[PDB]
Design a protein around this ligand. Sequence first.
Ligand SMILES: Cc1cc(-c2cn(CC(=O)Nc3cc(N4CCN(C)CC4)ncc3Cl)c3ncn(CC#Cc4cnn(C)c4)c(=O)c23)cc(C#N)c1O
Ligand SMILES: Cc1cc(-c2cn(CC(=O)Nc3cc(N4CCN(C)CC4)ncc3Cl)c3ncn(CC#Cc4cnn(C)c4)c(=O)c23)cc(C#N)c1O
Lengths: 122, 122
Amino acid sequence: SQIQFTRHASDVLLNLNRLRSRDILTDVVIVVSREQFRAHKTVLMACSGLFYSIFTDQLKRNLSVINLDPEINPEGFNILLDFMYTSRLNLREGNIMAVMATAMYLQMEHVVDTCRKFIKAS
Amino acid sequence: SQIQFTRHASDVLLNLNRLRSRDILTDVVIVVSREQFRAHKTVLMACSGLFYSIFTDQLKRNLSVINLDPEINPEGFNILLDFMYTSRLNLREGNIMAVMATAMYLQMEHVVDTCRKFIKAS
Ligand SMILES: Cc1cc(-c2cn(CC(=O)Nc3cc(N4CCN(C)CC4)ncc3Cl)c3ncn(CC#Cc4cnn(C)c4)c(=O)c23)cc(C#N)c1O
Ligand SMILES: Cc1cc(-c2cn(CC(=O)Nc3cc(N4CCN(C)CC4)ncc3Cl)c3ncn(CC#Cc4cnn(C)c4)c(=O)c23)cc(C#N)c1O
């Protein structure tokens, strides 16, 4: 019987992306080959099976640095990070295979399936 | 030209509420009279002008405990906290004045205006 604010969740994510752009309360750096990305652990846990599994582990929950597999493409990672914080996925012919492989590794099924839909359309 | 995932933001907030229910990566306790509430600073900053102003201050950004004004009703706070994490506002005749006063103090205009709409309807 509660009142539903349909734009609230979208506004919260917007605000979390603004804090990320200002490096406010970021608590991890993700290292992908020669590139570094700062983020909020909670948002990464909320959007990725890989990060959920890492940071739920009491052994790894306080890490300040995560080194991803050196095979991961930093641009594919960056696209996925931006998607976690915006709900927008920048999929194109030139990036679809890297994005799909990165989303498999991060354990992000809806993106992987969208990549399979993009492949069906091209 | 990016693909839009319309349920992503709602799913991220759901996941943040689940982490809050498990006390995973909570980093503050909010003290309201004889009651305590654990939360994520980022989510509080994203939803409240008062918490944004507190935690953006480099003086207060690392506090682990915030004591709210002792005049604030813990039940009104609890309703607002649950709203931050769910997009659902439990407004009723018996709680509207406390919720409205608490939302003014937390600096949450859309809730305050919804309380004014609820007042117009009753
Ligand atoms: C919002 C959003 C989320 C995810 C995603 C997040 N997470 C981590 C995770 O669920 N977090 C949490 C889960 C839970 N509860 C607890 C209660 N329960 C009942 C349900 C889950 N409580 C708190 C938190 Cl934080 C995911 N984990 C796994 N997968 C499956 C996979 C895969 C895959 C693809 N290929 N390969 C090789 C593997 C996910 O897709 C996700 C992905 C996208 C996308 N796109 C997206 O938009
Ligand atoms: C999603 C959601 C948010 C808010 C709310 C949040 N915040 C804190 C805040 O904006 N955070 C951030 C802001 C920004 N940018 C930076 C860029 N810019 C251009 C815009 C703002 N970047 C990062 C972060 Cl984290 C708010 N601050 C102030 N008010 C106004 C007020 C008031 C009031 C009512 N009575 N009284 C006495 C005062 C707010 O309503 C909010 C409220 C509700 C509700 N309901 C809600 O659903």
